[PDB]
Enzyme design. Structure first.
Site, PDB file in Angstrom:
ATOM      1  CG  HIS A   1      -1.901   1.157   1.192  1.00  0.00           C
ATOM      2  ND1 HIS A   1      -3.241   1.030   0.913  1.00  0.00           N
ATOM      3  CD2 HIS A   1      -1.697   2.469   1.464  1.00  0.00           C
ATOM      4  CE1 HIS A   1      -3.829   2.213   0.990  1.00  0.00           C
ATOM      5  NE2 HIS A   1      -2.916   3.101   1.330  1.00  0.00           N
ATOM      6  CD  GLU A   2       1.802   3.694   3.655  1.00  0.00           C
ATOM      7  OE1 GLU A   2       0.780   3.609   4.357  1.00  0.00           O
ATOM      8  OE2 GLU A   2       2.139   4.753   3.081  1.00  0.00           O
TER       9      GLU A   2
ATOM     10  CG  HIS B   1       0.226   6.200  -0.915  1.00  0.00           C
ATOM     11  ND1 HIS B   1      -0.721   7.071  -1.400  1.00  0.00           N
ATOM     12  CD2 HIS B   1      -0.399   5.446   0.020  1.00  0.00           C
ATOM     13  CE1 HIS B   1      -1.871   6.859  -0.786  1.00  0.00           C
ATOM     14  NE2 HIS B   1      -1.704   5.877   0.079  1.00  0.00           N
TER      15      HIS B   1
ATOM     16  CD  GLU C   1      -4.700   6.996   2.007  1.00  0.00           C
ATOM     17  OE1 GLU C   1      -4.736   5.779   1.754  1.00  0.00           O
ATOM     18  OE2 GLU C   1      -3.689   7.580   2.431  1.00  0.00           O
TER      19      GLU C   1
HETATM   20  O1  LIG Z   1      -4.010   4.430   6.351  1.00  0.00           O
HETATM   21  C1  LIG Z   1      -2.971   5.021   6.053  1.00  0.00           C
HETATM   22  C2  LIG Z   1      -2.800   5.854   4.792  1.00  0.00           C
HETATM   23  S1  LIG Z   1      -1.144   5.638   4.041  1.00  0.00           S
HETATM   24  N1  LIG Z   1      -1.792   4.759   6.743  1.00  0.00           N
HETATM   25  C3  LIG Z   1      -1.730   3.859   7.908  1.00  0.00           C
HETATM   26  N2  LIG Z   1      -1.489   4.440   9.294  1.00  0.00           N
HETATM   27  N3  LIG Z   1      -1.420   3.271  10.165  1.00  0.00           N
HETATM   28  C4  LIG Z   1      -1.682   2.164   9.458  1.00  0.00           C
HETATM   29  C5  LIG Z   1      -1.888   2.510   7.995  1.00  0.00           C
HETATM   30  C6  LIG Z   1      -2.172   1.551   6.936  1.00  0.00           C
HETATM   31  C7  LIG Z   1      -1.694   1.719   5.628  1.00  0.00           C
HETATM   32  C8  LIG Z   1      -1.938   0.766   4.641  1.00  0.00           C
HETATM   33  C9  LIG Z   1      -2.669  -0.386   4.971  1.00  0.00           C
HETATM   34  F1  LIG Z   1      -2.864  -1.304   4.049  1.00  0.00           F
HETATM   35  C10 LIG Z   1      -3.156  -0.583   6.279  1.00  0.00           C
HETATM   36  C11 LIG Z   1      -2.913   0.392   7.245  1.00  0.00           C
HETATM   37 ZN   LIG Z   2      -2.568   5.063   2.033  1.00  0.00          ZN
END
Ligand SMILES: O=C(CS)Nc1n[nH]cc1-c1ccc(F)cc1
Ligand SMILES: [Zn+2]
Length: 402
Positions: free
Chosen positions: A223-224, A227, A249
């Site tokens: 996920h990161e 981005h 998101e």
């Molecule tokens: O929700 C976001 C946006 S980057 N970040 C986060 N902060 N703490 C956990 C996450 C997060 C990011 C990706 C996932 F698949 C699950 C949780």
């Molecule tokens: Zn995200």
């Protein structure tokens, strides 16, 4: 609980370049003390791949106003987390393991290849006939003899700041330029830990009761990284675009969630970035000089990044088909939903889907593997995602305060 299982097949890891130990000695090259642009005492860092460094430390560095680990007056704090060398070693090996897990899937090899080729544009000059690096897209790497060398990079993985479970992908800004939204790109810093994860609820089709499961940390990291891809190619959606959760998101999650961005809006976004890419081709075209290496050559690095065409004459331009291909890859194909499919794990069904946090340790091969994550084949954890079921596989998940 001994082997890490970092190389299930073949002789050596396929993406990460070394099996590092946190105690391995500093050399000039892929283990070094480094300094981020902004001062600080140098920090020990490991270069896991061309353009990609890991700093196994809590992030007290990238923000002037988050220089301490203590809580203010869904989040979790522990000022002692990642303070000992054993923990930093475990963090480095856990991050290495997740990059190999990602790279073991076809989708992950595509994504990490795009990230590595996504070098931040040399748009640093104020003379429009001169290419120049932007220095916030570099780090300072200390050598064996104590001198510093400046090094361009695309991506840094670093531990969380005060709130241990706030993961995010952030980068240094430019006074004038919006680097994440003008096609240029900038070095991305991902706050992340492989030593914690999040729980969600799910009923698996005899009483049919609700299950308590944990998110696979490879999904969270992927996920990161998605981005980071958007931001490295400078096509991220302005964070001021939100629902009620940002478009960016929803786009990253993918699946049916992404379908809420209306198609006419997408087309407008796509055209805008097409034009940003056209401007970049022009800038390369007008380039006579380079500060700090050859003009025409840095020119080729950015031809490669942006998939530009070149005529018999030497002039670069943007091809509509190659642009649509790259943009669709980065925004539609690299998504969390698609990684879930490739990994075959259980995961939240929509971006909003709990309040449980869990301590985990994915480094032992007996807890988590590159191919199967928690759902170990040829055990009871292989079925019904029992490996991510925090009751069935309770030895792998420790529930912490919310
Ligand atoms: O929700 C976001 C946006 S980057 N970040 C986060 N902060 N703490 C956990 C996450 C997060 C990011 C990706 C996932 F698949 C699950 C949780
Ligand atoms: Zn995200």
């Amino acid at each position: 609980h001994h082997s890490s299982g970092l190389v299930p097949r073949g002789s050596h890891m396929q993406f990460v370049n070394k099996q590092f130990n946190y105690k391995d000695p500093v050399n000039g090259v892929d283990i070094a003390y480094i300094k981020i642009p902004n001062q600080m005492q140098p920090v020990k860092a490991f270069k896991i791949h061309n353009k990609i460094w890991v700093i196994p430390e809590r992030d007290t560095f990238t923000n002037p106003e988050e220089g301490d680990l203590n809580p203010p007056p869904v989040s979790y704090y522990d000022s002692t987390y990642l303070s000992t060398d054993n923990e930093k070693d475990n963090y480095l090996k856990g991050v290495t393991k997740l990059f190999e897990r990602i790279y073991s899937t076809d989708l992950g090899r595509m994504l990490l290849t795009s990230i590595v080729r996504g070098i931040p544009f040399w748009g640093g000059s104020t003379i429009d006939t001169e290419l120049k690096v932007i220095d916030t897209n570099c780090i300072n790497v200390i050598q064996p003899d104590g001198s510093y060398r400046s090094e361009e990079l695309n991506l840094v993985i670093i531990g969380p700041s005060a709130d241990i479970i706030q993961f995010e992908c952030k980068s240094f800004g430019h006074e004038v330029l919006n680097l994440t939204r003008n096609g240029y790109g900038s070095t991305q810093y991902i706050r992340f830990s492989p030593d914690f994860t999040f729980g969600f609820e799910e009923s698996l089709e005899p009483l049919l009761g609700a299950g308590k499961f944990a998110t696979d940390p490879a999904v969270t990291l992927a996920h990161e990284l998605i981005h980071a891809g958007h931001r490295l190619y400078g096509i991220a959606i302005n964070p001021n675009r939100v629902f009620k959760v940002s478009f960016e998101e929803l786009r990253t999650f993918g699946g049916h969630d992404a379908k809420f961005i209306d198609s006419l809006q997408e087309n407008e976004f796509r055209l805008y970035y097409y034009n940003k890419f056209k401007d970049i081709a022009s800038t390369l075209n007008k380039a006579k000089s380079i500060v700090g290496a050859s003009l025409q050559y840095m020119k080729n690095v950015f031809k490669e990044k942006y998939l530009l065409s070149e005529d018999t004459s030497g002039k670069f331009s943007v091809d509509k088909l190659k642009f649509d291909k790259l943009y669709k890859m980065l925004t539609e194909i690299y998504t969390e939903d698609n990684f879930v499919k490739f990994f075959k794990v259980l995961n939240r069904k929509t971006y909003l889907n709990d309040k449980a946090v869990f301590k985990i340790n994915i480094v032992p091969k007996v807890n988590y593997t590159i191919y199967d994550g928690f759902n170990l084949r040829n055990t009871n954890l292989a079925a019904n995602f029992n490996g991510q079921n925090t009751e069935i596989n309770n030895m792998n998940f420790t529930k912490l305060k919310n």
